[PDB]
Design an enzyme around this catalytic site. Structure first.
Site, PDB file in Angstrom:
ATOM      1  N   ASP E  38       6.567  27.446  17.073  1.00 18.62           N
ATOM      2  CA  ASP E  38       5.761  28.025  18.190  1.00 18.62           C
ATOM      3  C   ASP E  38       4.999  29.270  17.724  1.00 18.62           C
ATOM      4  O   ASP E  38       5.605  30.152  17.103  1.00 18.62           O
ATOM      5  CB  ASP E  38       6.643  28.382  19.393  1.00 18.62           C
ATOM      6  CG  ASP E  38       7.298  27.170  20.000  1.00 18.62           C
ATOM      7  OD1 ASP E  38       6.563  26.186  20.291  1.00 18.62           O
ATOM      8  OD2 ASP E  38       8.559  27.142  20.059  1.00 18.62           O
ATOM      9  N   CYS E 170     -25.627  30.640  -0.170  1.00 19.81           N
ATOM     10  CA  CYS E 170     -24.515  31.261   0.604  1.00 19.81           C
ATOM     11  C   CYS E 170     -25.035  32.580   1.203  1.00 19.81           C
ATOM     12  O   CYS E 170     -25.832  32.534   2.155  1.00 19.81           O
ATOM     13  CB  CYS E 170     -23.285  31.414  -0.282  1.00 19.81           C
ATOM     14  SG  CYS E 170     -22.550  29.815  -0.706  1.00 19.81           S
TER      15      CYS E 170
END
Lengths: 365, 366, 365, 364, 364
Positions: E38, E170
């Site tokens: 979790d 980029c």
């Protein structure tokens, strides 16, 4: 004395002979190098609102205004000692005045909730030093750069004195300190010397007032503070308060300081180490030296210089300087173990101090 | 009297201060701690500067109690030595100024309870402020704060009168007898100054706290009352009881005289061959000074209020020596304060003239 | 129980006899003192949005809502055990509901980008607990303080179930957890007990749904989670998921939990130390106890209590409590070495838990 | 010819780079440090990212000097190896881009001196930027920054012409000869590119700095001049002198040749049997590298500029071995850099072709 | 096949996963790390929560690569075990959601390159996102992201068509062959899903990268290309080459088959009596895994792509044992991850079915 004591950089005779020889001692020159030499981090590197030098010394914000002022007071004596350094002293005093006006220096006034304008009223702890610095700058340089501001601040101080039922001005609201007033009154003498005015006429009433509930005449010592709202005088006498106040008063009324000086020494000064050293108790009813703000011995070194007491000056410097472990590296002075706040400031000032009266009479450039 | 090990002055010396019209040297050294050093002494200025509390690591929530307990001690100093009355007056002026700084009451807003710390509830703050307004005026004769005093007294009176229970909550739905005792004492002080009868509400309060809020057999108050549920937390509290009985002793001496012996039997442990004492915070434990850790310090105040020199001596022998007091340059410091509010509550207990004597403080000299 | 095992505060027999004796054990009372006693820092000191108690325990923000809820579930059983503590339990549940609504408790919903309103849709992990807490508050107290909000939240939950193609509500978008749904459905049973409604009618369809792809019937264990968009079921079974779900379902359909309980124990529970202790594996294909979120043993202690399994309860508490080093100081319980998140919360709850069925049937005050 | 202990290459090898048209392997490894690793190499991108400087703990105030000294080295790399000229051009484009980022000039605003770092004063920043505009254009032939170069050159020329002293201040009322030497050299580079005569102001500047600002006997400049007071700080500075003489040598070789021997007598301490040298920062001390601690590093640059192989070798033997260089994956690192701007100034000194040779850089 | 010391499963076992239609127990334990706990597991939710990356100390700039490499592994899991295909689909939905969170692309804005991370340039981010849109749709059959996929594919196609060089930058003026290889592979995946011809641009790209961007004799790509200067950084890069050859093998198998042997001779060091191998990052060094420290990890992926079991085994014997893997509660952890992207690239190499096989993924 003419023997160099252990751990000392120069003899007491050498400090007292600087003005006669028209040269600062090598260690005073090395202090001026600390103050001026290294890019960006020296305290007198620039007029800008940069305080790196004080960040590196861990100067509390509230103390920066006193560090600048005491440096300024020493620089004014350097101007008088060596004509060749007068232009450098002038330049440093210009920076001292510029930095003194930076918000970082006076921000405590606003943050405590006392007001947004640090000169408007009260706050004599800040604006007394600023007003004296405006005057000393102009005496050293002959420059009118700050005269408009000087004329204004001198009149605010004069008007606030004249409006108060007690002689002088408060720091914080309802906090009266004789030492902060002594700075303000001296600033009026310097303005009068520059301008031919009579602002200094208020001094007599001030000297009469501080000799009532604010002094113990028998012990030659001032009480900590006065609080007009209650009329309370804090019932403790203070050596650093007295040493600083007597030093500056000696410039305005020499006889006042000459009357109390011997009593002050009997009350607070401990001679030790077979007469070679001395250290100053901060208050009565203790054997402890340099309690409270821890500046009794350092301000007494200034008072000894002001009064021309070479024996006490030598004893105090033997106490203060050796344990602080001075060294000169690349012709610049540093202390490994400064023993107090304002340490290099007050030792510099005491080493060069020509007397507040001699600064008042500074001949023009 | 013999000076016990680690003690600064005899119990005899503390109890004789008012008769001798002089504070002991260690009380004077505490006043020096409070007043002496530039910028960092707690009573240096009226400004919203809290350096003194930053240096002692006082939690924000505790600053209001530090100021108040200092103010309560200063009021007794005024009564002990007329020569220190003007200094005590000055310190109380600062205490009132600082008490109004946002740093002191900010918890009220930050917990989400409101932007105005006086308007309603929050008796833990405005009870102390109202008592401090009164004690300032009793010591000084000054009307500096009278407009605010008249206002706050009437907000307190009105809130009592509007509540179905006798008194005022702290946090919403949290009722504490010790915080109310401060508020009711503030009404007695306002009445002494003004000739009013706000203190008339006290009888109904003393009746209310003696129902579900006290264990009469053990002479001890329960921790708290919660009006919405009507719940009373089922643990008795020594620090709660010591503080409440001390302040009530100034309003209804018989109330506190009735419960004091049962209080001592319930909570006080005498040890070290009768030389020392330490106070359990609750029932069903041998542990001293649990919870907020103030049971012994507030019982030292209660012993002083009740004139119990034997218990006062035993508690101070427990509290002061391990805290390692020293006087350096005529100023008192503790190396190892054992609790929150340590120098505050030891100062207060050493000078305390009794809440009834503070109510009757004669006016100042001209 | 009768014999007190090493490091234990009270016997299993003593915990199980609390309701019959109408008194909590001294260690449960000391846990209530931790929860209520000390000014400002006790978790149930005030209704305000102050979380000092959770800051001091280092409770991660995301876990605060579960800490509050599990404390609330324990307080509801305290109300049933001792009528003298019912008013205190009511007061603590009022605080639990107030704090549960503070932004600090639900802020994760907004910060993850899922929305500004934590009850509007999804987020059953938060609003399921809140809705069950609204109900348990009203069962304990008889107060309508939160009834308007209770009526609203119950209808949002009912409507969202009815609109979904799967039986129940998601947590995060597209994350379905059987344990978070079990809380939501139990909240509908509590609303129905208070109001005479039939919101609980949706439960049968839910129990049918979770017994298809969400359970391994041979192991009596639920899969971690279901993800409607993909239809994915995470292929790992979870002991803490199963223990929590079977505990709450036992209050709605006792036979469902009774059917799977023995298989659950065979799948996950390791008995050790000559039968004196037990510890719970979190998933299949491992020997390791208390993996994953590390709550398998603590939630199984709750399930053992719910199912009336004194032998497993005793074994689990012998594993969990001694190493945590409990002590009672000034009549208040503390653990030096809590072994997990939600440690004092889940040990408190397991010690007092009267059964979810018994809480549903709580007689009025 | 003999490789001294802890050295990466001989002094002969550094001085022969341009003749051989190849950088030494350790200079190549320095260029790898500058260019290689994604995101954290100083010349990775044009963006306002300063990770490389954060990792070296560069004080904010020093970033502008780090960029400039890297740029000055890259200009010599272009001249040494035509095969690396395009890479040097690319790095200089990034150097100019980064130099304009607020992080580089923010001290100007924060000290309270103004919001625009080019408008007036601040020659410590805009002198370097203007020289970098020029060197970029000399290496690349690109007009990318020419509009900004034309503008900044004219601001500098106009501010010189408006001042009663020859040059421009840094902080208000702070005059530094080393910061001016950069500004004047930038005018020589603009003139070489454009056929203009901005460099004509240099004569009056060289006359001015030889009055109150130099001790001609010791061949050393005073720390600074302060026009408002007319004060000259009464301490001579070795790093101030080494830097100023190096750049002046590119404009008036005779000026620097006159003072260089006196400079060496004043400040340079030869030690270790003639194998090493270290530089005192000021007069009246035995201590090496006081103040900002850059006297020895700037003297390494001056030695290279003046073609003094013996002093270059002695200084590099003092500076490099204790800093513990290593080449890991063909990239240079120093374990114990002895000063600020350490890898910058050692790079620059190793490649430096002379400021006069950079002025005369032939086109691509 | 013998299990080597410190290994979790044999190389034979990794290569047999698709034939056996089952992941190895350690791959299942990696999926448990990715999915189980979790709030802190990386694939716990679609939300903009990055706890999993905070706990691994992933630098912000690397998060986009961690997500993408996880996504690439998940696509192969879908192909290996039909029973895990829906789980892989769910994780890829989360991978796409998280990839769009500002925390992932914020570097673009903070470097000053723009407020919109897909508009232009930034192929390092939007190439991965576009390939992830495609792999999600291949695994699931879902059109959830198709509108965004259609849009981003057209931005990429248009930007290629507008550029004078084959491909996309980029950072502005920074061209990387490895980031382009991702973008071109994304066009192949879009074409497989839609029947389009965006992949037609690939031939011109493969021609371009074989000119100044490769050393064909050493089978190695230069670090980067900078269109403004035309500079190619003069260092060859093993991790750049291994990644690019792996993805190109999916588009032009012959290209990667031609250079693979030369790549291995250039960079791969076999050691420990042939049992281990480690990869040098650049030429002229003996040091393994310099620079970004990923040469060996990307070569493990390339070995898998090329079907080189001997090199795969040698690299995993070097990488995995020192990292000290353990399986606790059926979940994998490494005590000493040797690099960035460690569990990501070892996961991907263990499952990788080949980029060509992912292109041909049959529908559910």
């Amino acid at each position: 004395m003419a023997e160099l004591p252990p751990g000392r950089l120069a003899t007491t005779e050498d400090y007292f002979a600087q003005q006669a020889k028209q040269a600062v001692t090598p260690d005073v020159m090395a202090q001026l190098a600390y103050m001026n030499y290294i890019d960006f981090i020296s305290p007198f590197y620039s007029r800008g609102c940069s305080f790196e030098a004080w960040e590196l010394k861990h100067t509390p914000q509230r103390v920066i205004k006193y560090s600048i002022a005491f440096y300024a007071y020493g620089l004014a004596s350097v101007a008088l000692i060596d004509p060749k350094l007068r232009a450098l002293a002038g330049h440093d005093l210009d920076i001292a005045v510029s930095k003194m006006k930076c918000k970082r220096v006076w921000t405590d006034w606003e943050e405590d909730g006392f007001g947004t304008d640090p000169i408007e009223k009260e706050n004599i702890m800040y604006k007394g030093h600023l007003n004296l610095m405006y005057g000393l700058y102009q005496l050293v340089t002959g420059s009118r750069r700050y005269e408009a501001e000087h004329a204004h601040l001198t009149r605010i101080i004069h008007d606030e004195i004249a409006a108060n039922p007690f002689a002088g001005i408060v720091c914080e609201p309802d906090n009266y300190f004789v030492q902060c007033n002594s700075v303000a009154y001296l600033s009026l003498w310097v303005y009068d010397r520059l301008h031919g005015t009579d602002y200094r006429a208020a001094t007599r009433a001030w000297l009469d007032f501080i000799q009532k509930d604010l002094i113990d005449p028998e012990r030659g010592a001032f009480y900590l503070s006065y609080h007009p709202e209650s009329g309370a005088v804090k019932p403790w006498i203070s050596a650093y308060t007295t040493a600083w106040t007597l030093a500056m008063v000696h410039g305005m009324d020499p006889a006042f300081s000459e009357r109390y000086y011997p009593r002050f020494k009997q009350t607070f000064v401990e001679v030790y180490d077979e007469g070679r050293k001395a250290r100053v108790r901060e208050t009565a009813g203790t054997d402890d030296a340099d309690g409270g703000v821890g500046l009794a011995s350092a301000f007494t070194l200034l008072l000894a210089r002001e009064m021309g007491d070479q024996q006490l000056f030598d004893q105090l410097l033997n106490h203060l300087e050796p344990p602080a472990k001075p060294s000169i590296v690349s012709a610049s002075l540093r202390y490994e173990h400064p023993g107090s706040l304002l340490f290099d400031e007050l030792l510099f000032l005491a080493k060069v101090h020509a007397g507040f009266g001699a600064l008042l009479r500074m001949p023009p450039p």
